[PDB]
Amino acid sequence: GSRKCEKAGCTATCPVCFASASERCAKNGYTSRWYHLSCGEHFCNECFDHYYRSHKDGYDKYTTWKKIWTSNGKTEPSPKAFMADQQLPYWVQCTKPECRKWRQLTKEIQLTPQIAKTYRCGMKPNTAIKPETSDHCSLPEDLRVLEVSNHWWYSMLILPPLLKDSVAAPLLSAYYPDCVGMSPSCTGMNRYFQPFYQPNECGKALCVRPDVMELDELYEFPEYSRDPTMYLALRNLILALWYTNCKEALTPQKCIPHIIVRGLVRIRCVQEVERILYFMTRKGLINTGVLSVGADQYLLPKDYHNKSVIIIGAGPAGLAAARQLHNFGIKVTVLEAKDRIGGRVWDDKSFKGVTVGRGAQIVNGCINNPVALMCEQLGISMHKFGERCDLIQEGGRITDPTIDKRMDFHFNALLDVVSEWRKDKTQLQDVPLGEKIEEIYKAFIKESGIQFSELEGQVLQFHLSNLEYACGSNLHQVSARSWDHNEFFAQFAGDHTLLTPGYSVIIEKLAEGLDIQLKSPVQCIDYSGDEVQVTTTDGTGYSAQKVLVTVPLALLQKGAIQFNPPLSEKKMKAINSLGAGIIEKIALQFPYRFWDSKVQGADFFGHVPPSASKRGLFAVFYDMDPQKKHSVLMSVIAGEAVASVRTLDDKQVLQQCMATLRELFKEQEVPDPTKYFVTRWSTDPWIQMAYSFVKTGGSGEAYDIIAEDIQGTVFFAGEATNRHFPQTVTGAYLSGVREASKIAAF
């Protein structure tokens, strides 16, 4: 006999049994012991025995469940665990907008998504009796509901909730379900969506542990750091639903019917799911990409809306941040120097049946790549590059396998020793990658003296040139220490693809509906007053509480924008420690596909260089039609070769490319090209570059330093502010998403 809960601090003054299993159930009365599940939920010792004791009628149900539990879950099976999983009644919320009260469902009703979707106060099964005229919504809500939102309610919930039939479950079978907030007694998505880490997996980009909270999740929800189970389950559920339907804004309304767990804790679960949703939204994990809203249904609570920002530059970073902030409900104006949007995304659509980027067009690693997500949203297909790239010599001969394999081995071995050499070196000891490679190569011929043929030397030149393409620089200017610094962080895994409709489709959709001022080069930014004043080159003024600069590295280096107060000497040192790399592209349309015989379907072919100085002159040719019907080749100018080309006119560059193509296909006539372009990014005044790299003496840390906001007022995005993902449209886009989150919080 007792009317008191076993649990010190429990706020229940009148414990009732929710089980009502035993014929001798204490109900609201006396029992030898009241078992505490939560502050609103207890069960009597008679019902405990009903399930727990061998001679009692519920022992069969308990032991059946217990065996299942023991071979699925990691957590000890208990009568409490049992009660919470199997016997605790369900709570559901009334669907009427003017009511919205929480109601307990009778002990035998199982909650389903459909019931949650449609429930109304006092809903009974079909009946032939005329319904009473009563109004069930005016019935008073159980007093225990109020208590759930108190911070202390959760601290007195004995066992964390465990979701049933979570959309996230299929993706997480490798884990103990209870360890990721899923019930151990349970049980056509885009192949580029792999949001959850798996056991023994290597690091991959934009991946979360389903069983561990990320740093920012700890920061935002410190009350779940000791007990992450409920948070994890909901976050995992939220990511599962977003990727399941990335074409719509994911809302608490659509998450609710998918939260299925017994007891008052379900109320707490749906309360939290809302906050976790907005957090994941602000951070750019969901409700992002090219999703639009459009026209008055913003993605963050009104609390965020009263604030204004100016974004400088309408490239991928600028538009990503602008898209996010606009979607949040924030006021956004964008100022762009040129007479078009896109920056280093600029597509030529004038070729027959094909789109050719003058700038970016490849996606490097589509797994969890926001470009892949955005293609999904737009219904865009991407062409996965095949592996084969034959090294064709002037003139005509395909480099033999054993020669190819051999020199590949040797080129990569030189990189191995660069890696060995740099291990304990400081910035002051850095040397150019090109110089270091030469140094090791020379000592290699010396120490072993294994002369390579002229051709073997040239094949090696092809690999060196491929590095110059990657860095946008002659190797003599790239840091041996830091050239591949980003690979410290998990990188984008899986396919490289050609973005067949071009990045401009994504660029255009991101910009759709935004206030963008073209031909408005910013000349000065003053963040001395109460808000920032930004002035264009013609004197036009704009003002906002915040400003985001996304202009290219080369323009920061030139100092084309005056900052008042000036940027720190530390920022400037970072800015000048990075290289503004450059490549250029040529694209060529022909009457017919003359390479088809020798190339045989490959997406690209390589060009063995005749000499070191020319190694960057069209090292690789790209077949710009995956369907293999049209006839367009693209190629790249890199390294020492871009300098060799700046005083040449388009016709000359074209003649050299044709000279090359004719050498590569000497076993035939090659038709003249009927259309072409040659890019001049190097001398485009507002761009002046292709992509950043680390100069000798420099550090990956420069990316972080450039990314550092100033006084929570001046923000920075762009490919040269992304340490994990430098250079790319994806890195630039992600840097904009990064900044929009920082700006929305401040």
């Binding site: 980009a205 991946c207 979360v208 740093l215 999740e217 951070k283 994990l285 962080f489 990064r738 920082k742």
Partner: peptide, 12 residues
Amino acid sequence: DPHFHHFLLSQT
């Protein structure tokens, strides 16, 4: 271990 962390959830 900073190698594995999600880029968007490690902005501290």
